[PDB]
Amino acid sequence: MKASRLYTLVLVLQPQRVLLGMKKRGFGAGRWNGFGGKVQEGETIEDGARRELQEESGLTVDALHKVGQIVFEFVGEPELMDVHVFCTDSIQGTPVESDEMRPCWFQLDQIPFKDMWPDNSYWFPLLLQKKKFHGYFKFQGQDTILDYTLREVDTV
Ligand SMILES: Nc1nc2c([nH]c(=O)n2[C@H]2C[C@H](O)[C@@H](COP(=O)(O)OP(=O)(O)OP(=O)(O)O)O2)c(=O)[nH]1
Ligand code: NA
């Protein structure tokens, strides 16, 4: 089995809208996603999620709720991505656009699934229902899922 690298993903989910960030530069740009990145040495997963939210979106929150975990495998890549998914409903500043990321609010009847990673269509609806989940997705490139598993869980 492949080794896996730890990542976080943060969704700011308010009662009527969700905050997403559009990748501005590099390869893979043009998709909306939660805020996140690699966990760094010595930090807890939750603290890495708070750090990435601040660095990417400019938002500082005191805490996050863990809602899921999703493992991504890419054909031709040696490591899995072990992505710990967090939520919060409570913010106290404004999102900030950078050269790398543009944050944007979407109403919850306008979730931009067509411009999100294909796996999001499967697990995002569970997140919206206050459910917790574990998932795994194998991708060929950016657009094609070859295999996936998804399960609702009581505890993550
Ligand atoms: N399938 C899927 N892949 C995702 C999602 N979100 C997400 O970042 N990815 C993948 C695509 C990118 O290749 C990779 C982004 O991680 P990253 O390399 O930007 O993390 P980072 O910011 O710590 O790295 P770096 O820019 O500092 O080098 O993760 C998602 O929601 N679904
Ligand atoms: Na990132």
Numbering used by the authors: 1 to 156
Quote the paper.
To validate the correlations between the structure and kinetics in the Asp-120 mutants, crystal structures of the Asp-120 mutants (D120N and D120A) in complex with 8-oxo-dGTP or 2-oxo-dATP were determined, respectively. In contrast, during the recognition of 8-oxo-dGTP, the structures of both mutants (D120N and D120A) show modes of binding of 8-oxo-dGTP that are different from that of the wild type. The face of 8-oxoG and the direction of deoxyribose are completely turned over in comparison with those in the wild type complex: this phenomenon is the result of the loss of two hydrogen bonds between Asp-120 and 8-oxoG. In the D120N complex, Asp-119 and Asn-120 interact with H-N2-C2-N1-H and O6 of 8-oxoG, respectively, whereas Asn-33 with O6 and N7-H of 8-oxoG. The 3′-OH group of deoxyribose in both complexes is directed away from Thr-8 and Gly-34, which are involved in the recognition of 3′-OH in the wild type. These findings are in agreement with the higher Km values of both mutants for 8-oxo-dGTP in comparison with the wild type. The electron densities of 8-oxo-dGTP in both mutants are ambiguous as compared with those in the wild type. This result indicates lower occupancy and/or loose binding of 8-oxo-dGTP. The differences in the recognition of the 8-oxoG and deoxyribose moieties between the wild type and the mutants give rise to the difference in the position of the triphosphate moiety in 8-oxo-dGTP between the mutant structures and the original ones (active configuration bound to the Nudix motif) in the wild type structure. The structural arrangement of the triphosphate reflects the lower kcat values in both mutants.
